[PDB]
């Protein structure tokens, strides 16, 4: 099978894996180490922000692609924002800083 863009998981905005739930080949931890091992950095930035997690970034990417303008507006991943709300929903203050 293959997936262009299908459904997304609820609690973390990621494409849920499976078949015929349209899945997505899980670009796991060792493959991220593999792209770090090359000089590939834009590939990894779109590989774990825009193609997967960012709720604005995937629709911005889809618009930019159907306009034929290959360009990504990265933003911030959504599951990292979930991690901030989970640590912040402990007694632990975690923030982002000034500039």
């Amino acid at each position: 099978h293959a997936r262009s863009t299908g459904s997304y998981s609820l609690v973390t905005q990621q494409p849920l894996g499976g078949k015929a739930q349209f899945g997505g080949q899980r670009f796991g931890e060792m493959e991220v180490w593999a792209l770090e091992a090359y000089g590939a950095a834009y590939t990894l930035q779109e590989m774990l922000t825009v193609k997967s997690d960012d709720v604005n970034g995937r629709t911005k990417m889809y618009k930019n692609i159907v306009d034929g303008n290959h360009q990504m507006e990265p933003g911030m991943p959504e599951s990292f924002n979930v991690l901030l709300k989970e640590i912040r929903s402990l007694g632990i203050n975690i923030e982002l800083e000034d500039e």
Partner: protein
């Protein structure tokens, strides 16, 4: 076609600045601010950018000179 990127590595070193330079050039050719300086063989803007690197007439320095020249022509075209 472009099977190996070796000549572009010999013109622009460091193998990582090549990606950034070719990316900037192919954006100048895809978003229609420019048009190619080499005959295209129905290649995409990626391969046309790498071929413009291999002909030597594009690097970071020539792109900077051309971009400042476009900014000076904007300053002259303010009227």
């Amino acid at each position: 076609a472009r099977v190996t990127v070796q000549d572009a590595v010999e013109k622009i070193g460091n193998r990582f600045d090549l990606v950034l330079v070719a990316a900037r050039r192919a954006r100048q050719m895809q978003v229609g601010g420019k048009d190619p300086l080499v005959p295209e063989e129905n290649d995409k803007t990626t391969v046309i950018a790498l071929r413009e690197i291999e002909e030597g007439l594009i690097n970071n320095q020539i792109l900077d000179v051309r971009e400042r020249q476009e900014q000076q022509e904007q300053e002259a075209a303010e009227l």
